């Protein structure tokens, strides 16, 4: 007979339960729930938060900023920068509120927990015989979000500039960025677009072609999406019947022949660049920003001949100046 | 790599600012330090100079109740170094030492780290994101921080890679599952 | 940037869907991509999947059942019927991408999503109410005052140093 | 705030006209086998 713990350890790893509670899950769930319910509430009634140092609370929220695009969870305040602000510090929960305290607690959680999902995203990859690299395609995800919640902060002074969670805060967070790092002028951010602007382009294909090649199982009596009862080892769609097309669209050799070399390529495109981006931001959190061509192109006498990217400079200098107005008393933003 | 990239980004000692660059924070403090000085000389009183935010134009209290440069530089109050320490006191910056003990050299060192900050451009162009084409330095501390990260990062996804597949060798999933005995086909399907 | 400026595109319902498409579509392109590379079977010999069965012969490389229970237990819900999973992969992007395209026509007549009345009015009379929305909104003026002139040469913009908006100290 | 006194009706409905539509086509469906 096995004692009670040897049971626990089976319940948590049981390939039976509705949703696997893998070990990682033992830190994922408790974490994930903490965050969510916290966020979920302070997204409703979020006392006026004061991100940037200056005491001038900017609290978008519902029970204040009565809107969905507006409100969001506002960051930590420079004041207590990169410093750990544990709810149990604020001499008053009201204090832990003024100083974005709710933010952190949530972030660190959803961060670490997502890391837990990352892991417990493979616990079945093993607890159920099958290739482990599913969880690996989840790297591109996590990492990124990490890059925009932890890296940039450690990089610069305090979390104060860490992707505020809320629709519009995103944009703010973004626009700031583009104005402090020519991040649109990056051969990295390119790679997020590069792939993202690819997966979109490709998801349309495999989804296209595949559906574009289905046997014949109903004749508009009902639908065509029935040409597959779940579990059957057949492949509702025809492979070569499929390639015959794309090979015929763009010359052959250009369309995929082997089906497994196909589906892979679909994690290949996304993940490959979505990582890069994830790195890009994570890179600039240390100030190795996008290309600088301001003025670059010159004249003979020396007059300045404008590079397209020079324009890009104004739409930048513009946001550059206005962002965080009245929050810095000197001429150089080093963060 | 991570516990690495950080050392260069922050550490002042094993990474002397004199051989490498001025640690980011060190840069931000150089700013205020400078204009605090440029200004006190013009006859102003940093001690009482009231900010525009109403916080403190050059100086303000910290959550610890200490004195630290103001504006935004508060983001880097934890930072320390040889050119400021003496111009420091028992409760943070010292209004006395900060008024006259302000020895000549510090103003310039305090300057160099301002001009030369851990910010640049891929194609090496020193200066904020949108500076004309002139200086072109890009801090080493910036270079070592970035570099390593990309590497130490990938590696973490590289450890996933193997530590996850190698878990399939001592298991035999590595190569897929067996077309006849797929372990999920013998499980009480939850629904 | 142009659009972020005088149009504040990022705040449009449509474009916020285009985003929905171009993102998820990519998510799919990969969720399924590697959802495959890690489901299929040992129906080849070596330690590499390239020689693995095909081209159209033996039926199916990935057991849509063994993979199923993987997500139905991790992320809660999974597929069934690759017939739709191949037609929902089409929708997602081709779909959302069309969305934006509409909104964009809206920008033609400058008929865009820029302001939230309920907001400007509550902002007007209260120097103490600030939302990201307003913050973003200030950017625009910046990314516009500085731009436009050297961007729209034909409308001879004459912009004095004072006039030009800009934070304190920067 | 000073919203649109009819943003409601507008919303709420747009989440009922369509929605209820499904609860309709769907419901008749489980009755394809004398059930609720």
């Amino acid at each position: 007979s096995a004692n009670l713990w040897e049971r626990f350890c089976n319940w948590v790893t049981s390939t039976d339960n509705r949703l696997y509670v893998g070990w990682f899950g033992v830190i994922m769930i408790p974490t994930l729930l903490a965050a969510t319910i916290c966020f979920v509430i302070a997204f409703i009634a979020a006392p006026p938060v004061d991100i940037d140092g200056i005491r001038e609370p900017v609290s978008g929220s519902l029970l204040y900023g009565n809107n969905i695009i507006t409100g969001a969870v506002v960051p930590s305040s420079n004041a207590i920068g990169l410093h750990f602000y544990p709810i149990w510090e604020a001499a008053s929960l009201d204090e832990w509120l003024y100083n974005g305290g709710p933010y952190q607690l949530i972030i660190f959680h959803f961060l670490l927990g997502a890391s837990c999902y990352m892991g417990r995203q493979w616990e079945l990859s093993y607890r159920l015989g099958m290739r482990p690299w599913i969880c690996v395609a989840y790297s591109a995800p996590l990492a990124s979000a990490f890059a925009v919640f932890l890296i940039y902060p450690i990089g610069q002074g305090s979390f104060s500039d860490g992707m505020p969670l809320g629709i519009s805060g995103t944009f703010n967070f973004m626009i700031v960025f583009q104005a402090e790092h020519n991040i649109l002028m990056h051969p990295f951010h390119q790679l997020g677009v590069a792939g993202v602007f690819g997966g979109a382009l490709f998801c349309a294909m495999h989804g296209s072609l595949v559906t574009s090649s289905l046997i014949r199982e109903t004749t508009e009596t009902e639908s065509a999406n029935y040409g597959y009862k779940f579990g059957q080892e057949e492949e509702t769609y025809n492979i070569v019947a499929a390639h015959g097309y794309f090979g015929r669209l763009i010359f052959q050799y250009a369309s995929f022949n082997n089906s497994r070399s196909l589906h892979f390529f679909l994690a290949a495109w996304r993940v490959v660049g979505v990582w890069f981006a994830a790195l890009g931001i994570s890179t600039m959190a240390f100030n190795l920003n996008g290309f600088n061509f301001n003025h670059s192109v010159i004249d003979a006498k020396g007059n300045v001949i404008n590079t397209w990217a020079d324009i890009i400079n104004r739409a930048n200098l513009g946001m550059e100046v206005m962002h965080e107005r009245n929050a810095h008393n000197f001429p150089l933003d080093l963060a | 790599g991570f516990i690495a990239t950080c050392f260069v980004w922050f550490n002042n000692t094993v990474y002397p600012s004199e051989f490498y660059g001025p640690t980011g924070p060190e840069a931000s403090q150089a700013q205020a330090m400078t204009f605090l000085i440029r200004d006190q000389k013009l006859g102003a009183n940093v001690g009482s100079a009231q900010g525009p935010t109403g916080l403190g134009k050059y100086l303000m209290r910290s959550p610890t109740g200490e004195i630290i440069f103001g504006g935004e530089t508060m983001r880097f109050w934890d930072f320390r170094g040889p050119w400021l320490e003496p111009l420091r006191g028992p409760n943070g910056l010292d209004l006395n030492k900060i008024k006259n003990d302000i020895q000549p050299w510090q103003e310039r060192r305090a300057a160099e780290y301002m001009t030369h900050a851990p910010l640049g451009s891929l194609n090496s162009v020193g200066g904020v994101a949108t500076e004309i084409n002139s200086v072109n330095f890009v801090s080493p501390r910036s270079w070592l921080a970035t570099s390593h990260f990309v590497l130490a990062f990938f590696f973490l996804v590289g450890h996933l890679w193997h530590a996850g597949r190698a878990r399939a060798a001592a298991a035999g999933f590595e190569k897929g599952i067996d077309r006849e005995s797929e372990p999920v086909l013998s499980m009480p399907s939850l629904d | 940037l142009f659009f972020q400026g005088f149009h504040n595109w990022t705040l449009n319902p449509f474009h916020m869907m285009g985003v929905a498409g171009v993102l998820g579509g990519a998510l799919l392109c990969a969720i399924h991509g590697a959802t495959v590379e890690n489901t299929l079977f040992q129906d080849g010999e070596g330690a590499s999947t390239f020689r693995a069965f095909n081209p159209t012969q033996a039926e199916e490389t990935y057991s849509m059942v063994t993979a199923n229970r993987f997500w139905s237990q991790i992320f809660g819900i999974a597929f069934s019927n690759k017939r739709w999973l191949h037609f929902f992969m089409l929708f997602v992007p081709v779909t959302g991408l069309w969305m934006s395209a509409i909104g964009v026509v809206g920008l033609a007549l400058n008929l865009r999503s820029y302001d939230f009345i309920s907001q400007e009015i509550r902002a007007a009379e209260d120097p103490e109410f600030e939302t990201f929305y307003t913050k973003n909104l200030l950017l625009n003026e910046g990314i516009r005052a500085w731009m436009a002139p050297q961007d729209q040469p034909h409308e001879n913009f004459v912009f004095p140093e004072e006039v030009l908006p800009r934070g304190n100290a920067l | 705030m000073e919203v649109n006194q009819l943003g409601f009706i507008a919303t709420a409905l747009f989440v009922l006209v369509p929605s209820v539509f499904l609860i309709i086509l769907y419901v008749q469906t489980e009755s394809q086998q004398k059930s609720s």
């Binding site: 029970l63 009862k229 | - | 059942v65 069934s80 | -």
Partner: peptide, 30 residues
Amino acid sequence: METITYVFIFACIIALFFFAIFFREPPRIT
């Protein structure tokens, strides 16, 4: 209102979530 209007549409998505991860109609294997 609105503030409520917004919370609801939400407290719903949570419902429609609970309904799909537990009242999912089992995938049959034939």
